[PDB]
Design a protein around this nucleic acid. Structure first.
Lengths: 145, 68, 53, 141, 104, 187, 141, 46
RNA sequence: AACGAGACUCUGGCAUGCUAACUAGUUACGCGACCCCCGAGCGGUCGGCGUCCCCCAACUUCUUAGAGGGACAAGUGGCGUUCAGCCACCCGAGAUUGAGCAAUAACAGGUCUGUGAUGCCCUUAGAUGUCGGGGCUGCACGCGCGCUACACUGACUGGCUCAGCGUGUGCCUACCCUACGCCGGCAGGCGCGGGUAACCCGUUGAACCCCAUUCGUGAUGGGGAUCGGGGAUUGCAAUUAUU
């Protein structure tokens, strides 16, 4: 036990030091179940321990692996930003950087006024769905005059 | 359930007994063989039902009169 | 007379039609029949199909 | 002499055939010990005849069983019936009929379907519903 | 010289194929051609299921149509000159007959 | 030798049925002793044929019930198996005595039929008493396990032990003592 | 003792330990990153999964020889959940099956045979029956 | 557009898109009040 | 006296009796081959395991499918104007298997958008008889048939072991079902064979279920809607997203 610290702050977000290490770090945006397992496998960490049982140099080893996947031989087919449209790079985007990357994508579609950009602006379904009977969020209207 | 016998069975059994009383008896398996050679019956399942009511009528005729 | 007087018809409902009456809806491709479903119920006895169950 | 018999048991689509011959007490299903057929929650179901009759009645013969068709549970009931039906047919041909009666009476007084088949098979589906008796929903207004 | 030679028969109707096939066995047996008996292949069933209505109205009834096909094989030990004789009589009904010069 | 069958592990000869109305309908001992609570028998085919089914198999059938569990009988045999092993550790007694006494305590003996909010009191037959007892104690085990770390094998053991002494902590005893209170007001 | 005489699950664990102790079986570089089949949601819990896959594959070739890469993907097939739609059957990874069969040929346990497919050698047959005796002896019969 | 031609000035950000993505085949909906038969209670008797 | 009912036709459950099979199997041996010594006992005649392989061996129990057989309220006990029938039980594979077909007389029921079935009316070269693009999918809102779930009688990761009914190279019309080897995380790609089918895909290695592991009552490792970025395949063409 050692009565060690059981809440910790990692990338401007709080991790509970109380779940299994592979399910604690998925509190970061851009890190799902599948990616969190592969990062800890490259970092040489035992998956059996609770997240409050990592030492100060073990968390810095995990953080420096999450920010640079391609230098620790994580494959290109794993990553969430592929050939990024403005500069051609491959990377994983995390935390408040993922919010801004979507914010730039919706404005890029709106500025040229393509059909995607207009559907996102009017608040309608963007992919191929019908709209007669599903997604209702207004109020019932009466027939009376 | 329902085991009542239709007029096609009941009339054919009476006409057999009027003509062949001296051939017949209480054994169903012998009556079933007699009824196959004295008559043309289209189905095996109808032949079994006719020999069944003939066997019931022989056991009545051994006690007293049957009006038909 | 025009040189462009037709469009490709190598698949889909444009390719196929009934052998008896030239209709395009509800036709049977099974076993090489190529009849319309209403024309099949009309000729089934002459083709040799029957119903038992 | 050569001295052997072949007989079968059934349930649903499953069939099992048992061959037995003069021997020392071997029993196998598909080349495996009958202690190792996979759904071992039912292990007392394929042990039932040898536990009920006792191993002294099995000591003169070697039995080999082959089985196919049906599902995991239907095959246990096919195996079970093939073994108890084989022993009584072997005894009928090669020993005294007074000893056949002991075997048949002890088996039937515990359970029918050690020696007589179960005739049940599926009903066919009918149009207008998801199965044999069920119907789709009905609506009005 | 002799061959091992194979005849196959096919029809929808069963009881015409029975009388055709029995006559091929008799003509071979009386001439000592050492015929191998009729092999019954599995029966083949064709099925078509259709709505009864021409127009899509009413309660939703269906028609279930089917056709059944029956197939047989016989093998002979004889010259190629005499299968041509026996495979030409009693074949009058709507039965297919086909023969191949070596398959045994 | 083959005249005694231990149901895997538990003897039948020492069991007793202490209500004379139920001795014909709770099938235990003699020809009703088997190795497992699983058979393929045709018990549904006639009206009273149901009374010949061993009581441990009737408990096993009634347990594979609630929608997501239909047809899963191999799972349901091991629930009964592990419940009987927990009952023997808690009580020190034969698990078949605990089941028989839980059935004798849980079945209601007066009830009121419906005639128009309006009801009239009537007697209950011994076959409906044993049918009601099984459904009540299976329901009691099923409702307690639904959001607890407790397994259903532990809840079925707790429910049978409380019913065998009539403690009114069980679901089956509270419901029996509700049905007979309401019927006593409709005489 | 033959492979048909012992319980099959601890035979796979005994054979997996024998392969992993030898040091001769080669492994691919991507063994720590692959999903193992299309229908799985996550990578396997055990770092040692490749030796267990080879041990099970050799045991399959003993009981039914003449398999190939396509028929190994049907042995390791399973159910796929499709989110809000109904579920269906789905086959295993072809590249994993092909590299596991090529890794066993490098131990001289497997051969490509006449007609088409693969089978065990006499040396492969010897090493499996040798481990079946070790699994039986561990129970002190 | 199915009845008219809509003009486009091709900005370089449009690269790799289709020409049909900038000329839309319909008018955005804005509702008028519901008519007779729109709800079960709306029934008319003379 | 006639039609409907019933009979009738197909179907399910029984035959160690009949006919008879290299496009179906079993048993056995002339035997032959690999592996194990666990076995009276050796590394064997003899034992164990086989979808390992010949038979110019014997045969039809298991598979196929032709002919016949079998069940009648027939036997025994009660109840019945002692008739017609009804209830229980013995013996038995079996004492209600499930479908198809179906009368007289009607309806302002549906269909002219199934038809070279069809009356009358309309239109007929600025056509109501062919190509290019769009729509049938548009969304404040009311209703109908359904799929997935709210978890521990569970979800996830490994391991083991069982089906039945069918379809298959398109005859204008141009496409079929797939074993085996190699490349790729995957979807997929290249090479090279079999099948017009009891012959090849195929012993159709199906899912739930079964055995072991991890989570711990938390909208949680339950649930997977909504939405960003990248890669294949069909096609003449995929944006209003084919899969």
């Amino acid at each position: 036990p050692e009565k060690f610290q059981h809440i910790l702050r990692v990338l401007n977000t709080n991790i509970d030091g109380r779940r299994k290490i592979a399910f604690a770090i998925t509190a970061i945006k851009g890190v799902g179940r599948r990616y969190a397992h592969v990062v800890l496998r490259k970092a040489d960490i035992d998956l059996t321990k609770r997240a409050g049982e990592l030492t100060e140099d073990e968390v810095e080893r995990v953080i420096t692996i999450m920010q640079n996947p391609r230098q620790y031989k994580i494959p290109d087919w794993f990553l969430n930003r592929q050939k990024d449209v403005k500069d051609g790079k491959y990377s994983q985007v995390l935390a408040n950087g993922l919010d801004n990357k979507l914010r730039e994508d919706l404005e890029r579609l709106k500025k040229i006024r393509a059909h995607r950009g207009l559907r996102h602006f009017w608040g309608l379904r963007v992919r191929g769905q019908h709209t007669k009977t599903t997604g209702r969020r207004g109020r019932t209207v009466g027939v009376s005059k | 359930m329902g085991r009542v016998r239709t007029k096609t069975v009941k009339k054919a059994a009476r006409v057999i007994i009027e003509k062949y009383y001296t051939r017949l008896g209480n054994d169903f398996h012998t009556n079933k063989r007699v009824c196959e050679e004295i008559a043309i019956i289209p189905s095996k399942k109808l032949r079994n039902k006719i020999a069944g009511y003939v066997t019931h009528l022989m056991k009545r005729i051994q006690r007293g009169p049957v009006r038909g | 007379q025009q040189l462009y007087w037709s469009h490709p018809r190598k698949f889909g409902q444009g390719s196929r039609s009934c052998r008896v009456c030239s209709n395009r809806h509800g036709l049977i491709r099974k076993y090489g029949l190529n009849m319309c479903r209403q024309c099949f119920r009309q000729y089934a006895k002459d083709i040799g199909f029957i119903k038992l169950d | 002499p050569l001295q052997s018999v072949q007989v079968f048991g059934r349930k649903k689509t499953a069939t099992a055939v048992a061959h037995c011959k003069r021997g020392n007490g071997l029993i196998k299903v598909n080349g495996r010990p009958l202690e190792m057929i996979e759904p071992r929650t039912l292990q007392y179901k394929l042990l039932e005849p040898v536990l009920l009759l006792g191993k002294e009645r099995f000591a003169g013969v070697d039995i080999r069983v082959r089985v196919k068709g049906g599902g995991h549970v239907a095959q246990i009931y096919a195996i079970r019936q093939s073994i108890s039906k084989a022993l009584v047919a072997y005894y009928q041909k090669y020993v005294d009929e007074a000893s056949k009666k002991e075997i048949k009476d002890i088996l039937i007084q515990y359970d029918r379907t050690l020696l007589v088949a179960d005739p049940r098979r599926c009903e066919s589906k009918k149009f207008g519903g998801p199965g044999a008796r069920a119907r789709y929903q009905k609506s009005y207004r | 010289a002799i061959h091992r030679i194979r005849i196959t028969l096919t029809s929808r109707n069963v009881k015409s194929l029975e009388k055709v096939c029995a006559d091929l066995i008799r003509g071979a047996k009386e001439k000592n051609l050492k015929v191998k008996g009729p092999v019954r292949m599995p029966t083949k069933t064709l099925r078509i299921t259709t709505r009864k209505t021409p127009c899509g109205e009413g309660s939703k009834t269906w028609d279930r149509f089917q056709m059944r096909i029956h197939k047989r094989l016989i093998d002979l030990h004889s010259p190629s000159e005499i299968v041509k004789q026996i495979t030409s009589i009693s074949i009058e009904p709507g039965v297919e007959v086909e023969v191949t010069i070596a398959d045994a | 030798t083959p005249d005694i069958k231990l149901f895997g592990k538990w003897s039948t000869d020492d069991v007793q049925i202490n209500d004379i109305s139920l001795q014909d309908y709770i099938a235990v001992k003699e020809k009703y002793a088997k190795y497992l609570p699983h058979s393929a028998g045709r018990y549904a085919a006639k009206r009273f044929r149901k009374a010949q089914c061993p009581i441990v198999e009737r408990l096993t059938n009634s347990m594979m019930m609630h929608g997501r569990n239909n047809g899963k009988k191999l799972m349901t045999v091991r629930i009964v198996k592990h419940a009987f092993e927990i009952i023997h550790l808690l009580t020190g007694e034969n698990p078949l005595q605990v089941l028989v006494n839980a059935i004798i305590n849980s079945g209601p003996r007066e009830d009121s039929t419906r005639i128009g909010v309006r009801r009239q009191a009537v007697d209950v037959s011994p076959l409906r008493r044993v049918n009601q007892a099984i459904w009540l104690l299976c329901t009691g085990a099923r409702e307690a396990a639904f959001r607890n770390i407790k397994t259903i094998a532990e809840c079925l053991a707790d429910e049978l032990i409380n019913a065998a002494k009539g403690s009114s902590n069980s679901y089956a005893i509270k419901k029996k003592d509700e049905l007979e209170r309401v019927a006593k007001s409709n005489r | 003792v033959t492979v048909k005489d012992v319980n099959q699950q601890e035979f796979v664990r005994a054979l997996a330990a024998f392969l992993k102790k030898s040091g001769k079986l080669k492994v691919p570089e991507w063994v720590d990153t692959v999903k193992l089949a299309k229908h799985k949601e996550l990578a396997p819990y055990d770092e040692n999964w490749f030796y267990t896959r080879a041990a099970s594959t050799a045991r399959h070739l003993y009981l039914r020889g003449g398999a190939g890469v396509g028929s190994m993907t049907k042995i390791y097939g399973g159910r796929q959940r499709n989110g809000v739609m109904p579920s269906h059957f789905s086959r295993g990874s072809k590249s994993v099956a092909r590299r596991v069969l090529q890794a066993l040929e490098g131990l001289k346990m497997v051969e490509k045979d006449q007609d088409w497919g693969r089978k065990l050698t006499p040396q492969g047959q010897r090493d499996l029956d040798r481990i079946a005796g070790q699994v039986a002896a561990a129970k002190k019969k | 557009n199915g009845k008219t031609f809509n003009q486009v000035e091709i900005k370089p950000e449009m690269i790799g898109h289709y020409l049909g993505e900038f000329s839309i085949t319909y008018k955005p909906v804005k509702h008028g009040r519901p008519g007779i038969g729109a709800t079960h209670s709306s029934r008319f008797i003379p």
